[PDB]
Each structure stands twice: as structure tokens, then as C-alpha cells.
mmCIF file of C-alpha atoms in Angstrom:
data_model
loop_
_atom_site.group_PDB
_atom_site.id
_atom_site.type_symbol
_atom_site.label_atom_id
_atom_site.label_comp_id
_atom_site.label_asym_id
_atom_site.label_seq_id
_atom_site.Cartn_x
_atom_site.Cartn_y
_atom_site.Cartn_z
ATOM 1 C CA UNK A 1 112.662 39.445 156.626
ATOM 2 C CA UNK A 2 109.832 38.767 158.788
ATOM 3 C CA UNK A 3 109.027 35.187 159.802
ATOM 4 C CA UNK A 4 111.880 32.243 159.595
ATOM 5 C CA UNK A 5 108.903 29.318 160.677
ATOM 6 C CA UNK A 6 105.101 29.289 160.825
ATOM 7 C CA UNK A 7 106.580 29.568 164.850
ATOM 8 C CA UNK A 8 106.875 32.705 164.614
ATOM 9 C CA UNK A 9 103.476 33.745 164.331
ATOM 10 C CA UNK A 10 100.997 33.415 167.892
ATOM 11 C CA UNK A 11 98.777 31.180 167.362
ATOM 12 C CA UNK A 12 94.708 30.769 168.950
ATOM 13 C CA UNK A 13 93.005 27.793 170.364
ATOM 14 C CA UNK A 14 89.368 27.646 169.314
ATOM 15 C CA UNK A 15 88.981 30.715 172.064
ATOM 16 C CA UNK A 16 92.225 33.047 170.257
ATOM 17 C CA UNK A 17 93.575 32.088 173.575
ATOM 18 C CA UNK A 18 97.507 32.028 172.319
ATOM 19 C CA UNK A 19 97.536 28.543 171.213
ATOM 20 C CA UNK A 20 100.860 26.034 171.541
ATOM 21 C CA UNK A 21 101.859 25.971 167.749
ATOM 22 C CA UNK A 22 105.196 25.526 168.795
ATOM 23 C CA UNK A 23 104.312 22.217 169.922
ATOM 24 C CA UNK A 24 105.032 20.640 166.174
ATOM 25 C CA UNK A 25 108.003 21.859 165.866
ATOM 26 C CA UNK A 26 109.881 18.461 164.490
ATOM 27 C CA UNK A 27 107.278 17.062 163.115
ATOM 28 C CA UNK A 28 105.264 18.661 160.059
ATOM 29 C CA UNK A 29 102.082 20.070 160.575
ATOM 30 C CA UNK A 30 98.789 21.210 158.383
ATOM 31 C CA UNK A 31 97.456 23.884 158.768
ATOM 32 C CA UNK A 32 94.286 24.834 157.019
ATOM 33 C CA UNK A 33 92.285 27.625 156.782
ATOM 34 C CA UNK A 34 88.825 26.033 157.336
ATOM 35 C CA UNK A 35 85.635 27.070 156.043
ATOM 36 C CA UNK A 36 83.713 26.474 158.690
ATOM 37 C CA UNK A 37 80.288 25.405 157.954
ATOM 38 C CA UNK A 38 77.645 22.638 158.721
ATOM 39 C CA UNK A 39 77.327 19.886 156.849
ATOM 40 C CA UNK A 40 78.817 20.937 153.907
ATOM 41 C CA UNK A 41 82.875 19.868 153.562
ATOM 42 C CA UNK A 42 85.145 18.758 150.722
ATOM 43 C CA UNK A 43 86.938 15.987 151.392
ATOM 44 C CA UNK A 44 89.438 17.909 153.371
ATOM 45 C CA UNK A 45 88.215 16.937 156.801
ATOM 46 C CA UNK A 46 87.539 13.534 156.773
ATOM 47 C CA UNK A 47 91.721 13.992 154.918
ATOM 48 C CA UNK A 48 92.178 16.259 158.015
ATOM 49 C CA UNK A 49 91.030 14.611 160.848
ATOM 50 C CA UNK A 50 92.634 10.999 159.779
ATOM 51 C CA UNK A 51 95.707 12.775 158.757
ATOM 52 C CA UNK A 52 96.236 14.460 161.584
ATOM 53 C CA UNK A 53 95.692 11.527 164.743
ATOM 54 C CA UNK A 54 97.710 9.145 162.130
ATOM 55 C CA UNK A 55 99.950 11.267 161.804
ATOM 56 C CA UNK A 56 100.186 12.692 165.444
ATOM 57 C CA UNK A 57 102.033 9.911 166.684
ATOM 58 C CA UNK A 58 104.560 11.999 165.143
ATOM 59 C CA UNK A 59 103.788 15.488 165.636
ATOM 60 C CA UNK A 60 101.667 16.105 162.895
ATOM 61 C CA UNK A 61 98.861 18.450 163.290
ATOM 62 C CA UNK A 62 96.038 19.789 161.723
ATOM 63 C CA UNK A 63 95.507 23.128 162.999
ATOM 64 C CA UNK A 64 91.905 23.832 161.317
ATOM 65 C CA UNK A 65 91.616 28.033 161.541
ATOM 66 C CA UNK A 66 87.915 27.788 160.655
ATOM 67 C CA UNK A 67 87.618 31.784 158.348
ATOM 68 C CA UNK A 68 85.269 33.827 160.345
ATOM 69 C CA UNK A 69 82.491 34.358 157.294
ATOM 70 C CA UNK A 70 81.694 37.730 158.771
ATOM 71 C CA UNK A 71 84.620 39.343 157.162
ATOM 72 C CA UNK A 72 83.266 38.650 153.968
ATOM 73 C CA UNK A 73 86.278 37.504 152.131
ATOM 74 C CA UNK A 74 86.883 34.793 153.419
ATOM 75 C CA UNK A 75 87.743 31.668 151.536
ATOM 76 C CA UNK A 76 84.800 29.450 152.041
ATOM 77 C CA UNK A 77 82.345 31.767 151.339
ATOM 78 C CA UNK A 78 80.594 34.710 153.241
ATOM 79 C CA UNK A 79 77.400 35.043 153.981
ATOM 80 C CA UNK A 80 77.194 30.869 154.602
ATOM 81 C CA UNK A 81 77.747 30.606 158.139
ATOM 82 C CA UNK A 82 75.711 33.836 158.801
ATOM 83 C CA UNK A 83 72.163 32.914 157.112
ATOM 84 C CA UNK A 84 73.008 28.814 158.276
ATOM 85 C CA UNK A 85 73.591 27.031 160.920
ATOM 86 C CA UNK A 86 76.824 26.642 161.035
ATOM 87 C CA UNK A 87 79.323 25.807 164.528
ATOM 88 C CA UNK A 88 83.217 27.027 164.539
ATOM 89 C CA UNK A 89 83.796 23.981 162.526
ATOM 90 C CA UNK A 90 85.340 21.778 164.936
ATOM 91 C CA UNK A 91 86.483 18.460 164.582
ATOM 92 C CA UNK A 92 89.495 16.025 165.839
ATOM 93 C CA UNK A 93 92.219 18.672 165.156
ATOM 94 C CA UNK A 94 93.389 21.458 167.509
ATOM 95 C CA UNK A 95 90.542 23.742 165.530
ATOM 96 C CA UNK A 96 91.591 27.232 166.618
ATOM 97 C CA UNK A 97 89.443 29.919 167.372
ATOM 98 C CA UNK A 98 88.745 31.046 163.775
ATOM 99 C CA UNK A 99 90.496 33.757 161.628
ATOM 100 C CA UNK A 100 90.558 35.812 158.792
ATOM 101 C CA UNK A 101 92.242 33.112 156.329
ATOM 102 C CA UNK A 102 92.095 35.073 153.164
ATOM 103 C CA UNK A 103 93.635 38.331 151.579
ATOM 104 C CA UNK A 104 92.112 40.888 154.276
ATOM 105 C CA UNK A 105 93.642 40.079 157.277
ATOM 106 C CA UNK A 106 94.862 36.639 157.018
ATOM 107 C CA UNK A 107 96.728 36.474 160.491
ATOM 108 C CA UNK A 108 100.554 36.856 160.748
ATOM 109 C CA UNK A 109 100.914 32.854 160.500
ATOM 110 C CA UNK A 110 99.013 32.792 157.689
ATOM 111 C CA UNK A 111 100.013 36.027 156.012
ATOM 112 C CA UNK A 112 103.492 33.535 156.257
ATOM 113 C CA UNK A 113 102.194 31.059 154.793
ATOM 114 C CA UNK A 114 100.610 32.834 151.747
ATOM 115 C CA UNK A 115 103.459 35.251 151.896
ATOM 116 C CA UNK A 116 106.067 32.644 151.849
ATOM 117 C CA UNK A 117 103.753 30.386 149.670
ATOM 118 C CA UNK A 118 100.308 31.150 147.726
ATOM 119 C CA UNK A 119 98.511 29.888 145.792
ATOM 120 C CA UNK A 120 97.890 27.071 143.293
ATOM 121 C CA UNK A 121 98.069 29.717 141.133
ATOM 122 C CA UNK A 122 101.036 31.564 139.689
ATOM 123 C CA UNK A 123 99.515 33.387 142.931
ATOM 124 C CA UNK A 124 96.579 34.081 145.451
ATOM 125 C CA UNK A 125 96.000 33.795 148.739
ATOM 126 C CA UNK A 126 92.708 31.690 150.181
ATOM 127 C CA UNK A 127 89.978 31.304 148.528
ATOM 128 C CA UNK A 128 88.408 28.050 149.249
ATOM 129 C CA UNK A 129 87.891 25.634 152.429
ATOM 130 C CA UNK A 130 90.022 23.539 154.006
ATOM 131 C CA UNK A 131 92.490 24.969 152.249
ATOM 132 C CA UNK A 132 95.798 23.091 153.804
ATOM 133 C CA UNK A 133 99.623 24.051 154.096
ATOM 134 C CA UNK A 134 101.683 21.745 154.556
ATOM 135 C CA UNK A 135 104.357 23.529 157.109
ATOM 136 C CA UNK A 136 107.345 20.599 158.073
ATOM 137 C CA UNK A 137 108.983 20.215 160.443
ATOM 138 C CA UNK A 138 110.918 23.515 161.817
ATOM 139 C CA UNK A 139 107.264 25.117 160.945
ATOM 140 C CA UNK A 140 108.602 25.798 157.152
ATOM 141 C CA UNK A 141 105.386 25.903 155.017
ATOM 142 C CA UNK A 142 106.310 23.759 151.925
ATOM 143 C CA UNK A 143 102.914 23.340 150.177
ATOM 144 C CA UNK A 144 99.374 23.765 150.070
ATOM 145 C CA UNK A 145 96.445 21.505 149.133
ATOM 146 C CA UNK A 146 92.874 22.416 148.085
ATOM 147 C CA UNK A 147 89.718 21.189 149.713
ATOM 148 C CA UNK A 148 89.547 18.749 147.206
ATOM 149 C CA UNK A 149 92.724 17.065 147.850
ATOM 150 C CA UNK A 150 92.666 13.645 150.170
ATOM 151 C CA UNK A 151 94.721 12.249 152.775
ATOM 152 C CA UNK A 152 96.901 10.541 150.549
ATOM 153 C CA UNK A 153 97.098 13.291 147.831
ATOM 154 C CA UNK A 154 98.260 15.880 151.284
ATOM 155 C CA UNK A 155 100.128 12.561 153.129
ATOM 156 C CA UNK A 156 102.377 12.126 149.864
ATOM 157 C CA UNK A 157 103.936 15.893 150.477
ATOM 158 C CA UNK A 158 103.654 15.658 154.124
ATOM 159 C CA UNK A 159 104.630 11.435 155.132
ATOM 160 C CA UNK A 160 108.591 12.355 153.514
ATOM 161 C CA UNK A 161 108.434 15.063 156.347
ATOM 162 C CA UNK A 162 107.193 13.166 159.285
ATOM 163 C CA UNK A 163 109.430 10.718 157.884
ATOM 164 C CA UNK A 164 111.896 13.076 157.233
ATOM 165 C CA UNK A 165 113.597 12.738 153.725
ATOM 166 C CA UNK A 166 115.502 16.056 155.351
ATOM 167 C CA UNK A 167 116.860 16.190 151.386
#
């Protein structure tokens, strides 16, 4: 099959310049398909902000991929960042140049992510705000958290990987 880790897939910084994803090789990284918007988040913002900075120290990242609602299928909404004034999210993370994180295009990396682990349901393909994926030391997504889970809720899956319990 295709994809051993998320690192099989080129990432793109907030201007679609190829981002160095594999710099999170060694310590888990949480990549979030985040719905940009303005003023409206769902816990995941303070979650991601604090998680990233508390754990980038080890190697952890919160990669923010601020879904391009311009597509229509996007997990955050659709018309929201088109009718309202919304910057491409942006924060204290490696926030990337927004990708179609959703069931239409996602992105090879997220296609890899939901193909590795679909949704909180039996199956799902991204349909919320931030929606994290707990990517492991070697870039293997083993979780995905909903925008509604906080620092704590993520750490409890993250820390075992940061701290490297292995088994």
C-alpha cells in the first residue's frame, strides 16, 4: 500500500511552500484540519496553541491546516470564511496554506490520515473545526481529536508518544 507515515506526504507552509513535515520525526505531532474563521473556535485553539508550545520542546507540533471552505465540502462549514472576514486562521503553530481537509480532496497527507484512521464514527472523513490527528513519533496517525477536546484530552494520547512509552 501507500503511506508508511504521514511523512510520505509533502506538507506546505501557510503559502503552499513545501513545509518540512519530517521535522516532527521523533516526537509525535498533532496535525489539525482547522477551520480558519474569525473569533470562533472550539477549545482546540487554546488546546493546539498550548500543546504545540509545551511539546515542540520535545518535537511535537500542532500543524494547523486551515481548511479552504471555498471548496464547499469543508469540515468547519462552507460560506463562513467567504461571507465573513476570516484570515487563514494563523496562530502560534505551523499553520499551513489551508488545504481541502475534507471528503473531497483532503490532501495526500490527510487522505493518508483519514485513510489510516477515518473518524470518531465507524467511519468519517473530517467534518469539524480543528479536528486533530495524533501523529506519532514516526509520523503515524493513531488518533484524531474533535474540536471539543482540549489540551488534556489530547495530551493523554500524545504524552505516551512524546514520552515514548512505545508499548
